């Protein structure tokens, strides 16, 4: 079946797989194949929505001294973009300390909380994201941030793309286009029950029905 046409493909890929298809198995197989094939210094990043899937993938992959990021997409920005390069973009007064109750309805008040209060902000409206817009703002203001992101990873694995806001799409597409980093997207179109958290199913469907540089496969197993 098509499960052998994926491991042999290197680049941008989609996998429109429904429930019970075995997304974890194919994701782990592709990750292991990519790591075994490549002999360079580059790494991979696997971004999920829950800590359970992150820990499952971490346990399945094993142990290595190569630095790969496995975790949630909220931890990705905090660990890679915001915490290291916040002061290089805005200034030395902006703090890199935070432990995240204090949600507001504006971006400027989010910056004010992060600075004066010294705690990561939030938004009251679930249709808009503070983390993934601040991350993209930092990426466009810091040259060393973009340099590190380009020098570090050669592929990023994304799963459950249907439950993604517009800011997540913006950041991922910025990475794909402006920084020339490959993407591996897996998602079920009919699993948008998380719409109560601001999920936008239109992004995955638009990618499926309009993308020209994406290779598309479907799994019925």
């Amino acid at each position: 079946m098509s499960r052998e046409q994926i491991i042999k493909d290197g680049g941008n890929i989609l996998v429109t797989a429904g429930a019970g298809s075995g997304k974890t198995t194919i994701l782990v197989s592709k990750i292991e194949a990519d790591l075994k094939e490549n002999k360079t210094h580059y790494s991979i990043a696997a971004v999920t929505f829950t800590n359970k899937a992150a820990k499952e993938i971490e346990g399945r992959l094993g142990y290595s001294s190569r630095g790969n990021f496995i975790g949630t997409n909220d931890g990705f920005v905090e660990s890679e973009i915001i915490r290291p390069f916040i002061k290089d973009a805005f200034g030395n007064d902006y703090p890199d300390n935070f432990t995240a109750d204090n949600q507001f309805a504006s971006y400027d008040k989010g910056l004010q909380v992060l600075k004066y209060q010294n705690i990561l902000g939030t938004y009251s409206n679930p249709k808009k994201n503070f983390k993934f817009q601040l991350a993209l703002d930092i990426l466009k203001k810091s040259l060393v941030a973009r340099q590190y992101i380009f020098s570090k990873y050669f592929k990023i694995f994304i799963d459950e793309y249907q439950d993604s806001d517009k800011d997540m799409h913006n950041l991922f597409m910025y990475l794909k286009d402006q920084l020339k980093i490959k993407l591996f997207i897996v998602g079920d179109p009919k699993q948008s029950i998380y719409i109560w958290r601001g999920a936008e199913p239109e992004n995955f469907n638009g990618l499926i029905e309009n993308s020209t540089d994406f290779n598309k496969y479907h799994l019925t197993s």
Binding site: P84, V144, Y148
Partner: protein, 476 residues
């Protein structure tokens, strides 16, 4: 992308030393203690198996453990777009860089002695700004800096030259496949211990014309290893008790392309000297060797050298020697070269070669009638009179030359030698004009002359004013 500089303070016999670097570096000199301590400092900074231990009381300068050891290395990150080693460095460093300083990086070492525990702890830092460095993170026995650099140390100790070449080959084709994800630096210490000459030349070609040795530091006592040198830093350690170092960025110009094998062979043996006298041909070699053997037999034991320059300009040799701190003396004579094509116009070759070493360059040409009737000795004396006039005209320039240790003859060396030993030359060259006869066969007649010179003639030549370069060579 590029190594730039290194600073060492209060470490062993180093007190405060600043050395400029490149990717390929060669260190040479007569100290032989600072040369090894240089590589030890490099190993301490970049080698985890050496840094794994601490610093003793003997590692501090003057054994005064109340001072701090600092070793700081500088890199250039200008070619991030075209280099993949810059990415290897940048992927482990994240946050220690700033955008205003995106092209320079620092790696530092610091040690302070503990008198109660009798231990010297080593702590590493990097940063883009030298006034704001932070500790390199790590867990357990491992460091974040150990993920980047791979230091390969080569030493013959701790026919058989073929076994050495096999060792070099296995090194070259092992460090490639296994370390495609690291930055590899080679430290080669005296590779000529029990090595045949041709094998030394082969290793020189490997070092300077193969891509397997992008970064290395080499210590050598042999000029055969330097037959192929190009695009390298030469670091010279001065022969004193206080470590003093001079460095030069060596290159060969595209103009000096067809004679590159002669420049390298000539200059390799002069790098291991203290004073060098630059001469033209083998006649001067014969004469000065005879005179020095008669007067100063041990001139070459004390660091003297005679260098044959040939048919080129002095810039290439003088730049290197001056930058390395070696004293250079030049003896030349006033030459007129007939221009290619038009007849009757000559070039002030000697004056031009002497001027180009003073920054001032080139001079206008001259024209001499030389009617077709005259020919032979008459033409020679006509040209000699013109040379005398030219020499008298530029007296101030000649006085400027003498201040730079440049000695230009009015006509030639034969006439200067006559002005000193004319009676002896008349005796030996019976029934001829000594200068004219000596100028017929330069090589055989010079041997005839030296075979009939006594100690009195040698001391007459040595003590003359026209031969003041020989006193400079032997240090008076």
């Amino acid at each position: 992308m590029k190594f730039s500089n290194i600073t060492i303070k209060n470490f062993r016999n180093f007190e405060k030393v600043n050395i400029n670097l490149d990717n390929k570096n060669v260190i040479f000199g007569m100290n032989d203690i600072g040369k090894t301590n240089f590589l030890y400092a490099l190993r301490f900074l970049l080698d985890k198996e050496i840094r794994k231990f601490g610093f003793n009381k003997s590692d501090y300068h003057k054994h005064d453990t109340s001072k701090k050891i600092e070793i700081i290395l500088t890199l250039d990150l200008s070619n991030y777009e075209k280099d993949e080693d810059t990415k290897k460095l940048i992927s482990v460093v994240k946050g220690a860089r700033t955008s205003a300083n995106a092209d320079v990086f620092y790696i530092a070492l610091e040690s302070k002695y503990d008198d109660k525990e009798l231990y010297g702890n080593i702590i590493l830092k990097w940063g883009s700004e030298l006034d704001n460095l932070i500790d390199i993170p790590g867990r357990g026995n491992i460091n974040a800096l150990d993920n980047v650099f791979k230091v390969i140390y080569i030493n013959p100790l701790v026919g058989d030259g073929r076994r050495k070449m096999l060792s070099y080959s296995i090194y070259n084709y092992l460090a490639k496949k296994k370390y495609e994800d690291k930055i590899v630096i080679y430290l080669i210490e005296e590779p000529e211990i029990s090595l045949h000459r041709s094998m030394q030349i082969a290793l020189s070609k490997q070092l300077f014309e193969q891509s397997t040795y992008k970064y290395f530091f080499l210590s050598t006592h042999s000029p055969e290893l330097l037959y192929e040198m190009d695009n390298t830093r030469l670091i010279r350690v001065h022969s004193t008790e206080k470590v003093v170092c001079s460095s030069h960025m060596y290159n060969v110009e595209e103009a000096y392309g067809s004679v590159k094998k002669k420049l390298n062979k000539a200059l390799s043996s002069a790098l291991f000297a203290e004073r060098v006298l630059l001469i033209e041909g083998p006649s001067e070699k014969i004469l000065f060797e005879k005179v020095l053997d008669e007067v100063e037999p041990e001139y070459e034991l004390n660091g003297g050298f005679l260098l044959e320059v040939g048919g080129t300009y002095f810039n290439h040799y003088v730049c290197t020697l001056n930058d390395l701190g070696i004293t250079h003396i030049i003896k030349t004579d006033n030459d007129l070269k007939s221009k290619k094509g038009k007849k009757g116009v000559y070039e002030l070759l000697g004056l031009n070669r002497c001027l180009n070493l003073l920054g001032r360059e080139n001079l206008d040409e001259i024209t001499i009638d030389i009617p077709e009737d005259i020919k032979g000795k008459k033409k020679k004396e006509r040209l000699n009179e013109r040379k005398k006039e030219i020499f008298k005209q530029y007296k101030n320039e000649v006085g400027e030359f003498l201040g730079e240790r440049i000695y230009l003859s009015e006509i030639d060396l034969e006439n200067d030698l006559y002005s000193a030993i004319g009676e002896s030359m008349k005796r030996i060259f019976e029934n001829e004009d000594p200068v004219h006869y000596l100028q017929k066969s330069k090589l055989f007649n010079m041997v005839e002359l030296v075979n009939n010179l006594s100690t009195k003639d040698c001391f007459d030549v040595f003590e003359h004013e026209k031969f003041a370069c020989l006193k400079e060579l032997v240090g008076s």
